């Protein structure tokens, strides 16, 4: 089930058994890459880039077409995100709740939700330090979080 929520759900994606590019797809590996470079310069996350290609360009899986993942492609060209996408979004959510909470002292529920969000930040940051994505001095601070993202 969920790490914090009591509910347990089964909604997810199911990848097909066949890993080959379909015949009707007329884009090449090089053509897909320049589309990725164009959308990244527009300020789109790798999750959103893959959504756009699926919906409009008929690219079901970038990995099957080019042989590389979207984040790996961007890193090679030099368009790497400053912070990991899942960590970046969690910090953004904590800033929004803390900004709301400073104008509403009586919102006990928002105070409780803020604790849960910060716990996921600590778990995610500890994992990233072990993988050496983050320096072994990076720390999450409430005042520093606004400048972080």
């Amino acid at each position: 089930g969920r790490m914090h929520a009591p509910g347990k759900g089964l909604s997810q994606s199911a990848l097909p058994y066949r890993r080959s590019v379909p015949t009707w797809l007329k884009l090449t590996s090089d053509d897909v890459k320049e589309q990725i470079y164009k959308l990244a310069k527009k300020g789109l996350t790798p999750s959103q880039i893959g959504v756009i290609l699926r919906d409009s360009h008929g690219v079901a899986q970038v990995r099957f077409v080019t042989g590389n993942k979207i984040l790996r492609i961007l890193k090679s060209k030099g368009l790497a995100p400053d912070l990991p996408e899942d960590l970046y979004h969690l910090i953004k959510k904590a800033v929004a709740v803390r900004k709301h909470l400073e104008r509403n002292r009586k919102d006990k529920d928002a105070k409780f939700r803020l604790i849960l969000i910060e716990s996921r930040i600590h778990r995610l940051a500890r994992y990233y330090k072990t993988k050496r994505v983050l320096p072994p001095n990076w720390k999450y601070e409430s005042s520093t979080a606004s400048a972080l993202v």
């Binding site: 959504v51 756009i52 699926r54 919906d55 409009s56 360009h57 008929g58």
Partner: peptide
């Protein structure tokens, strides 16, 4: 135009 059936955009 090629369109995914469960499009989100």
């Amino acid at each position: 135009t090629t369109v995914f059936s469960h499009a989100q955009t």
